[PDB]
């Protein structure tokens, strides 16, 4: 257990794994005996990794007791688990940061759009008042050569007003179209900070599933995932319990491409394809 804990500490040292507002549970599932009494978030993560590795041994012991067939769990399994953890952490963090940057750019563009729409409002009212005074002057002075010129300029100003009104309604039609986009982007941007908090636990679960649960059947895979999730819950490590592992570890384009390659439309088959990918 000490060797596993030290390997986890040394390998997962360039990862953030720092939660300033981490709350130590009253009953901490102490897996490493020399774990400090007030463990930090990183120490809890490494303890969870060691617990996952020993949970694999427990599952193999259970299958051997039932008379089933087991595969030897080696330190290379732990090494793959931590490597997958680091890779998934980096990948998910990069994807989330890039998505949030793109969404922030979109919101800034939309705000500049509404500001320019208000600027078009003031331009429209200025043009309208200039047209009013121009045709008033034209009617006054026509009622007593240059006067045809004045009314021609008035007509040109009406034409410009009509073009500006077309721009008004077109930009307003575009502006209302992006209302659903702007609200959904605002909700996602507001939830961005929450999503970053759950990267560690989700990546730990996904890496454990990829590295360990490959050989077992669906029932044992679900049992292992439930055990790991319960351990993470007892250790106060945040993770999303709403998304599926298949949805988390793959995108819809890759799933569609797999179905084109005669991959059966099954959750276990999708997990197997993900393992064959990662």
């Amino acid at each position: 257990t000490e060797a596993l804990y030290q390997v986890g500490k040394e390998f997962t040292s360039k990862m953030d794994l720092e939660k300033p507002n981490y709350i130590v549970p009253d009953y901490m599932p102490v897996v490493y005996d020399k774990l400090p009494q007030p463990p930090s978030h990183r120490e809890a993560i490494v303890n969870s990794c060691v617990f996952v590795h020993q949970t694999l041994h427990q599952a193999n012991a259970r299958l051997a007791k039932r008379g089933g067939r087991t595969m030897a769990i080696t330190p290379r399994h732990y090494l793959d688990f931590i490597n997958h953890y680091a890779n998934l952490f980096h990948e998910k963090r990069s994807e989330l940061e890039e998505q949030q940057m793109h969404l922030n750019v979109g919101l800034r563009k939309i705000k500049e759009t509404v500001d320019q729409v208000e600027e078009l409002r003031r331009d429209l009212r200025i043009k309208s008042q200039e047209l009013e005074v121009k045709n008033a002057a034209a009617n006054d002075k026509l009622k007593k050569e240059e006067y045809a010129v004045l009314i021609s300029e008035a007509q040109a100003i009406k034409a410009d007003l009509a073009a500006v009104e077309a721009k008004v309604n077109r930009s307003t039609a575009l502006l209302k179209s992006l209302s659903a986009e702007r609200e959904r982007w605002e909700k996602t941007s507001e939830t961005f900070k929450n999503q970053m908090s759950t990267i560690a636990g989700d990546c730990l679960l996904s890496a454990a599933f990829i590295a360990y649960a490959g050989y077992f059947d669906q029932q044992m895979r679900q049992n292992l995932f439930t055990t790991w999730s319960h351990h993470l819950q007892q250790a106060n490590i945040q993770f999303r319990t709403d998304i599926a592992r298949t949805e988390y570890l793959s995108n819809a384009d890759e799933r569609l491409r797999w179905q084109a390659s005669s991959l059966p439309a099954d959750d276990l088959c999708t997990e197997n394809a993900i393992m064959l990918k990662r």
Binding site: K14, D16, E18, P20, H90, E97, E98, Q100, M101, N104
Partner: protein, 319 residues
Amino acid sequence: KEWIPRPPEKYALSGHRSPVTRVIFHPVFSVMVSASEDATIKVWDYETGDFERTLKGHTDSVQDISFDHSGKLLASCSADMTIKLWDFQGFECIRTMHGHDHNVSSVAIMPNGDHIVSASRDKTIKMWEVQTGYCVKTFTGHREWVRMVRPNQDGTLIASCSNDQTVRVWVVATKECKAELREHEHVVECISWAPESSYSSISEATGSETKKSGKPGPFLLSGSRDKTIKMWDVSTGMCLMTLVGHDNWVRGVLFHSGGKFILSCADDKTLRVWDYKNKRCMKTLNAHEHFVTSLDFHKTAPYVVTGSVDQTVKVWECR
């Protein structure tokens, strides 16, 4: 020593897809680091002008970056309300400190290399631990957005410049504003203090009288959007000289490594190097076609780099 940038340029480094906000020099390596508004920090080699790599961990526009004494870490701040600590050996973000509400403007690491200081719109300055990442003490007193913050040469004195017309100097120990300066015509934006190589050079430039201890005391410099650069005394708090002649808004000020000339940039699209002891060298150097944002002076090498809004970083020889 008497280095002075020349109108000819060496390389025009253009890799950013958004205006460059600050440029710094690596303490030991021949590396230039530039922070821009596209949420990316780019690494260049100023000797040969080759793009090296980018650090794209930030979400919003990156405002200020700072190295430590060893150059082993890079602290960065952005508009996404967070401070990212970069490990320069692996070029990977290793600690992302949260809090310090709203757009973070400046970030700096004291020569101790154990704590970090940052400024933001939330009218306060926070103090962080590089090892852990906990804000242990929060500095208050600024009534508006704080733009730039800079520590001393031994990690004890800190000054912060803000839109509230105040350049107020602070202490680590008692957390009290020992000197408060509210006398600029318009908003102060950039500050940088005096290295020990220039303490003696101030005496004959201003005629200041030494105290009983004999030390002239720490000095202060602050550029303000009122097109004036003014160099102050931290110990007392009185003006020593006002430098006037910048056409437009000043953006960054610092002292020559030899501590003899004044070299600063401004929104006047030009780089101006000034002499303060004798008011002799008034060279004006056009640097960028658009507004110039930041600048830096190499401690030993004869190179100066300037960051501008025109998407480019430029390197000047010193002669």
